[PDB]
């Protein structure tokens, strides 16, 4: 089983993601009223996805334009060009995963610790966390694409995705349990949507990121066996899935706000 992705679809999917991400970032750069820890983490997510989609659009454009002739470069340069575009792409993904975690933690520190929320989380500390995430994203992305053929990089990337999945799951499931307690209190005085929302958040997160780190895992655990071969042969679809995530997350987090919907409608 192999799914054809390598031409035109991948590019256009990236360009659509570029539009949606930029629209989020532009709608936060204007309308300064929204500039806050909540929406600054959302803007940083959309920026990271913007760089994912842009750098993949650049990668597939360069590769396509090297194909069928046209542009020519000596391979000793081109391999380092590839290395740099990978380092920017990988940094923008690890940053996107961290900002998904940061939104989870912000919401959690806004349900629990609800009263002290604006004493615990502040826009200075939001700025500091965003900077730390981007610095770490580049230092690791550089280290990973330098040592990329060592097992430890692939294993650590997988472990990083699994830890982020566990963090999001634990925080969001605890928040939904608390929402169900509130719904029971309301029913007791007054006398599903939470499950839908949580299963969309985690389903899209796991479905569109998960199979790539599966791929990396199988590159470690079964490098050369036909039982793993149809995972390896569909790699381009797993990148297309990450670009699909970069399209879906603006619709889950930013355009979820009515005020953003207004400021986009203009």
């Amino acid at each position: 089983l192999e799914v054809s992705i390598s031409d035109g679809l991948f590019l256009s999917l990236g360009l659509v993601s570029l539009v949606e991400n930029a629209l989020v970032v532009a709608t936060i750069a204007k309308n300064r009223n929204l500039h806050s820890p909540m929406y600054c983490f959302i803007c940083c997510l959309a920026l990271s996805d913007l760089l994912v989609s842009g750098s993949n659009v650049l990668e597939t454009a360069v590769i396509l334009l090297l194909e069928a002739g046209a542009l020519v470069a000596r391979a000793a340069v081109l391999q380092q060009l590839d290395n740099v575009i990978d380092v920017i792409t990988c940094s923008s993904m690890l940053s996107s995963l961290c900002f998904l975690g940061a939104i989870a933690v912000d919401r959690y520190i806004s349900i629990f610790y609800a009263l002290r929320y604006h004493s615990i989380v502040t826009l200075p500390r939001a700025r500091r966390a965003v900077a730390a995430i981007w610095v770490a994203s580049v230092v690791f992305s550089t280290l990973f694409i330098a040592y990329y053929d060592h097992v430890a990089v692939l294993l650590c990337l997988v472990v990083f995705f699994l830890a982020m999945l566990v963090l999001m799951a634990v925080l969001y499931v605890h928040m939904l349990a608390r929402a169900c307690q509130h719904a029971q209190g309301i029913a007791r005085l007054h006398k599903l949507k939470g499950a839908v929302t949580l299963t969309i958040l985690l389903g899209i997160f796991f479905l569109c990121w998960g199979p790539f780190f599966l791929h990396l895992t199988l590159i470690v655990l079964c490098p050369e066996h036909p039982t793993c071969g149809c995972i390896f042969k569909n790699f381009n679809l797993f990148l297309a899935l990450i670009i699909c995530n970069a399209i879906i997350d603006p619709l889950i987090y930013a355009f979820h706000s009515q005020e953003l919907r207004r400021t986009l409608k203009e």
Partner: peptide
Amino acid sequence: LDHXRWK
């Protein structure tokens, strides 16, 4: 050069 890595 390939799309992406570890292919």
